[PDB]
Amino acid sequence: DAVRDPQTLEILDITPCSFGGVSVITPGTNTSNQVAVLYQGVNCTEVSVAIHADQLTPTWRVYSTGSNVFQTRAGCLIGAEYVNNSYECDIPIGAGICASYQTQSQSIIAYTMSLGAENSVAYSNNSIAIPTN
Amino acid sequence: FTISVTTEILPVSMTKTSVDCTMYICGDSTECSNLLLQYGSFCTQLKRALTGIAVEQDKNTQEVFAQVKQIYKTPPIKYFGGFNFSQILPDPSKPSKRSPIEDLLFNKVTLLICAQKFNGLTVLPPLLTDEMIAQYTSALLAGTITSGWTFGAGPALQIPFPMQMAYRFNGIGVTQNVLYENQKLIANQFNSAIGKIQDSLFSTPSALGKLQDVVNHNAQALNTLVKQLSSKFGAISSVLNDILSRLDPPEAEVQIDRLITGRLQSLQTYVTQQLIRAAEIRASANLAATKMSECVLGQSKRVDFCGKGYHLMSFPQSAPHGVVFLHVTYVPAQEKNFTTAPAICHDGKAHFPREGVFVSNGTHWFVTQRNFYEPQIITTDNTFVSGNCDVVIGIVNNTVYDPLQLELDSFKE
Amino acid sequence: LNTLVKQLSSKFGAISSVLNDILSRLDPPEAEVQIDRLITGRLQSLQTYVTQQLIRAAEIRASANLAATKMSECVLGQSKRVDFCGKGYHLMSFPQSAPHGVVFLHVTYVPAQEKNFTTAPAICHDGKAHFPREGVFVSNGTHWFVTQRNFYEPQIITTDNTFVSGNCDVVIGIVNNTVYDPLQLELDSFKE
Ligand SMILES: *[C@@H]1O[C@H](CO)[C@@H](O[C@@H]2O[C@H](CO)[C@@H](O)[C@H](O)[C@H]2NC(C)=O)[C@H](O)[C@H]1NC(C)=O
Ligand SMILES: *[C@@H]1O[C@H](CO)[C@@H](O[C@@H]2O[C@H](CO)[C@@H](O)[C@H](O)[C@H]2NC(C)=O)[C@H](O)[C@H]1NC(C)=O
Ligand SMILES: *[C@@H]1O[C@H](CO)[C@@H](O[C@@H]2O[C@H](CO)[C@@H](O)[C@H](O)[C@H]2NC(C)=O)[C@H](O)[C@H]1NC(C)=O
Ligand SMILES: *[C@@H]1O[C@H](CO)[C@@H](O[C@@H]2O[C@H](CO)[C@@H](O)[C@H](O)[C@H]2NC(C)=O)[C@H](O)[C@H]1NC(C)=O
Ligand SMILES: *[C@@H]1O[C@H](CO)[C@@H](O[C@@H]2O[C@H](CO)[C@@H](O)[C@H](O)[C@H]2NC(C)=O)[C@H](O)[C@H]1NC(C)=O
Ligand SMILES: *[C@@H]1O[C@H](CO)[C@@H](O[C@@H]2O[C@H](CO)[C@@H](O)[C@H](O)[C@H]2NC(C)=O)[C@H](O)[C@H]1NC(C)=O
Ligand SMILES: *[C@@H]1O[C@H](CO)[C@@H](O[C@@H]2O[C@H](CO)[C@@H](O)[C@H](O)[C@H]2NC(C)=O)[C@H](O)[C@H]1NC(C)=O
Ligand SMILES: *[C@@H]1O[C@H](CO)[C@@H](O[C@@H]2O[C@H](CO)[C@@H](O)[C@H](O)[C@H]2NC(C)=O)[C@H](O)[C@H]1NC(C)=O
């Protein structure tokens, strides 16, 4: 975990390599051919600087940081745009964040889940509701 | 009588893990991976098993908690007939909209160790955060205190809370006039019991044992899997770079095959034990979903299912990796003994009670309901007639007053 | 099954995966050494297959027990357990056979069109409180009725709908109303 430098007497911690899984988020191939990429459990302020001249393990790095780069609690999402809306979950990414393929003309978006329609029962101490049908 | 609130704690899900088998077995070396690909497809099976476990654990919490079509809210004024649910409703002062009981349940379960899972081991986050599960439990609570069991069948239909409690008293077999004549006292008993839960889990340090056992089992399995990577399995060294840079390749490959076999067996034992534990957690989550459907969304007649006693109603609370059910039940209390008969001999006709029993202290006979002492005068409306009096064993002499003949004989003459 | 058959074509550190090629190329003292790696690999694949089949068999047994309980409880009777036999109040269920399983068609209720009313827990008539035998007291705004709980069907409040328990000084929310005794209305006319 830690090593003393044997030349100058200070103490330095050792942190291992970042690494992680790469997930590809797609709709059906009968619908479209564009995809989004999730790098799992990774702050992507270092994904951008790790894109070098043929150094990273995945050979495809064409996406890089060409916009739509979003930080989630489940990792970093590239190729999907975050919106300030809430729909029913379509493709689960994680930590309350899902993705879908909708209009705006037609692209992959990321959002937080809506748990349901909002309701408020009109409670009173002297009122009832009774079905007729 | 007595109203009692008990707690039942059920685990619903566990942690989601993913393993890179090539990184775990092979310490970023090209040729030891070349021996690893000679073994076929033992790694895709482990990957498929772990993904199936993770998807199942996401499915478990959605089965237990996501059972409302709409999110319900309490009215901004909160007076429910003297019943006082501030210990279980969420408060808005806290940044997390959780009840006080949920705040203690979050604080009690104690969830360099995270810096050691860096050998291909990754822990995935759950799909539903703690906030969303809290909004599920608040929606369930608001729907069950503002509508009753009506929102579990169709649309939510409002009813005052004492009328709902009278419905539930009729459900357990007691007339509802017992409620309305004792309401305040009944409310006070509820306001006692929901208080005591606040300390009953607090003084006891082993109350939340199941969720802590889930956390401890996952942690020790992960730590054992990491510690097994530093064993030799029949070699000079467990370090792959030292054995690579010390010997020639023809003996190096046939010796590191032993490390490959040992690490592969440790991975297989870990995956099989996670499969068995995932089956057990799936069974527990199915039981928790059944109790949420039957104890919370309705009133249950099954004995000892929703707590000890006669079930009145239940409340859900969320917990780390689980759920806590607060079961409110009706327990009988101070009882008296009387003499009883199966029938009454009046005019050569036997009278049986429509509902209730015949009781006597020694002088007179009365008809009472079975679960509460409320004696009433035996009339022809309380009893029904069947046969003569020579067939029933234990029939006694008494009189049965007709409330029609007396008024006719008074008013006509 | 495809994984188990495809696993048969790997070497496990031997010269070849074909056993007859190993026997037809080498002398027996080296042939046994080459065979033992294949034997260990194929035993390991068979044991993993049997263990995973046992786990899946337990998982199928649990759902088969659940389906047997659903056939006993939803089809051969009517169940009061909530959300066991579908959504709503249970009426019936029908079985259908499917490849490797069963499909249950659950017939249930949904209450559809609701109306809003005002309620009281009791009725003050003559210094005596009246509680409904079955149903609730319902006012549209002017008159009061007794209905059943799951369907709106108003009826005139009589002594055949309610029962009497005590006076009118203990129930919180009791209201003024009249209660019609159907004996006195008949007995005050034919006698005179
Ligand atoms: C119906 O609702 C009102 C408002 O919610 C109730 O008023 C509460 O009454 C209790 C005692 O019965 C007090 O402790 C509360 O402070 C009151 N809340 C208020 C004024 O906001 C009231 O009980 C009900 N109406 C009637 C006529 O009794
Ligand atoms: C109870 O609901 C049914 C529908 O389930 C109503 O029947 C409809 O009545 C309207 C008015 O006559 C017709 O236009 C529809 O065609 C009927 N639908 C069907 C499927 O028959 C019925 O009227 C309702 N009853 C009340 C009193 O509201
Ligand atoms: C419901 O119960 C809570 C206790 O959980 C009551 O809150 C107490 O109120 C008194 C009077 O203001 C304070 O002295 C206490 O400190 C409060 N306790 C807590 C834990 O905050 C609350 O008043 C009750 N509700 C009603 C309507 O009376
Ligand atoms: C039924 O039991 C309750 C206790 O659960 C009794 O209520 C107590 O009665 C005594 C005597 O008057 C009081 O000192 C207490 O304060 C009461 N407790 C509460 C919570 O109100 C009740 O009296 C019993 N009923 C009968 C008929 O014996
Ligand atoms: C058995 O219980 C009943 C309860 O009503 C008692 O019956 C009444 O007792 C009083 C005593 O003063 C009499 O004035 C009433 O006429 C009785 N009622 C009827 C309907 O007869 C009865 O006394 C109790 N027995 C004992 C031994 O206490
Ligand atoms: C009260 O019940 C007793 C039995 O416990 C009845 O006594 C006998 O009843 C039989 C059958 O009617 C008669 O033949 C006998 O003559 C009765 N014995 C006596 C000693 O009278 C009795 O009839 C019942 N009724 C009354 C009003 O006492
Ligand atoms: C509450 O329901 C009763 C049902 O009888 C209504 O009373 C009747 O209303 C009709 C419509 O005007 C009249 O023709 C009848 O003569 C009324 N009957 C009686 C006995 O008065 C009553 O109007 C309803 N109230 C409201 C406000 O809708
Ligand atoms: C109707 O209910 C009211 C209360 O809402 C009763 O009115 C009170 O009755 C007592 C007992 O007779 C009187 O002492 C009070 O003066 C009454 N209060 C008021 C404000 O007038 C009433 O008795 C009930 N019955 C009838 C027929 O009106």
mmCIF file of N, CA and C in Angstrom, chain B residues 229-247 255-256 258-259 263:
data_model
loop_
_atom_site.group_PDB
_atom_site.id
_atom_site.type_symbol
_atom_site.label_atom_id
_atom_site.label_comp_id
_atom_site.label_asym_id
_atom_site.label_seq_id
_atom_site.Cartn_x
_atom_site.Cartn_y
_atom_site.Cartn_z
ATOM 1 N N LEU B 229 -5.061 -15.445 -3.871
ATOM 2 C CA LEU B 229 -4.185 -15.124 -4.989
ATOM 3 C C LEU B 229 -2.708 -15.134 -4.610
ATOM 4 N N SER B 230 -2.380 -15.172 -3.318
ATOM 5 C CA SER B 230 -1.001 -15.128 -2.851
ATOM 6 C C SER B 230 -0.509 -16.478 -2.338
ATOM 7 N N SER B 231 -1.087 -17.577 -2.810
ATOM 8 C CA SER B 231 -0.656 -18.913 -2.433
ATOM 9 C C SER B 231 -0.020 -19.614 -3.626
ATOM 10 N N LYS B 232 0.762 -20.653 -3.327
ATOM 11 C CA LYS B 232 1.696 -21.230 -4.285
ATOM 12 C C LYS B 232 1.118 -22.392 -5.085
ATOM 13 N N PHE B 233 0.276 -23.222 -4.459
ATOM 14 C CA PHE B 233 -0.352 -24.414 -5.045
ATOM 15 C C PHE B 233 0.655 -25.432 -5.583
ATOM 16 N N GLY B 234 1.885 -25.449 -5.074
ATOM 17 C CA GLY B 234 2.878 -26.382 -5.573
ATOM 18 C C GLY B 234 3.913 -25.787 -6.507
ATOM 19 N N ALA B 235 4.442 -24.615 -6.165
ATOM 20 C CA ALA B 235 5.454 -23.949 -6.971
ATOM 21 C C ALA B 235 6.518 -23.376 -6.044
ATOM 22 N N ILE B 236 7.617 -22.889 -6.631
ATOM 23 C CA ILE B 236 8.589 -22.136 -5.839
ATOM 24 C C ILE B 236 8.006 -20.792 -5.409
ATOM 25 N N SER B 237 7.292 -20.112 -6.303
ATOM 26 C CA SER B 237 6.755 -18.801 -5.978
ATOM 27 C C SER B 237 5.324 -18.678 -6.474
ATOM 28 N N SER B 238 4.561 -17.821 -5.798
ATOM 29 C CA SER B 238 3.235 -17.421 -6.243
ATOM 30 C C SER B 238 3.260 -16.176 -7.116
ATOM 31 N N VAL B 239 4.406 -15.514 -7.234
ATOM 32 C CA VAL B 239 4.529 -14.295 -8.023
ATOM 33 C C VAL B 239 4.855 -14.692 -9.454
ATOM 34 N N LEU B 240 4.042 -14.223 -10.399
ATOM 35 C CA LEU B 240 4.153 -14.683 -11.777
ATOM 36 C C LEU B 240 5.338 -14.051 -12.500
ATOM 37 N N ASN B 241 5.694 -12.811 -12.152
ATOM 38 C CA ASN B 241 6.824 -12.157 -12.808
ATOM 39 C C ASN B 241 8.155 -12.758 -12.371
ATOM 40 N N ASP B 242 8.274 -13.137 -11.094
ATOM 41 C CA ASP B 242 9.509 -13.746 -10.604
ATOM 42 C C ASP B 242 9.743 -15.121 -11.222
ATOM 43 N N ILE B 243 8.694 -15.944 -11.301
ATOM 44 C CA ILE B 243 8.820 -17.257 -11.919
ATOM 45 C C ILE B 243 8.973 -17.135 -13.434
ATOM 46 N N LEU B 244 8.494 -16.037 -14.029
ATOM 47 C CA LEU B 244 8.716 -15.817 -15.453
ATOM 48 C C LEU B 244 10.154 -15.401 -15.742
ATOM 49 N N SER B 245 10.726 -14.540 -14.904
ATOM 50 C CA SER B 245 12.071 -14.026 -15.125
ATOM 51 C C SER B 245 13.154 -14.868 -14.465
ATOM 52 N N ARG B 246 12.794 -15.957 -13.790
ATOM 53 C CA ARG B 246 13.785 -16.812 -13.148
ATOM 54 C C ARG B 246 14.123 -18.061 -13.955
ATOM 55 N N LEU B 247 13.150 -18.676 -14.619
ATOM 56 C CA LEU B 247 13.356 -19.958 -15.279
ATOM 57 C C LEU B 247 13.158 -19.842 -16.786
ATOM 58 N N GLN B 255 5.047 -25.282 -14.999
ATOM 59 C CA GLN B 255 4.908 -24.964 -13.588
ATOM 60 C C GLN B 255 3.805 -23.939 -13.310
ATOM 61 N N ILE B 256 3.620 -22.930 -14.172
ATOM 62 C CA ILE B 256 2.552 -21.952 -13.943
ATOM 63 C C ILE B 256 1.179 -22.487 -14.302
ATOM 64 N N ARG B 258 0.074 -24.963 -12.739
ATOM 65 C CA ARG B 258 -0.411 -25.240 -11.388
ATOM 66 C C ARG B 258 -1.076 -24.018 -10.760
ATOM 67 N N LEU B 259 -0.479 -22.834 -10.941
ATOM 68 C CA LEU B 259 -1.105 -21.594 -10.484
ATOM 69 C C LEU B 259 -2.412 -21.328 -11.217
ATOM 70 N N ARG B 263 -5.966 -21.006 -9.128
ATOM 71 C CA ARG B 263 -6.774 -19.793 -9.200
ATOM 72 C C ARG B 263 -8.116 -20.042 -9.880
#
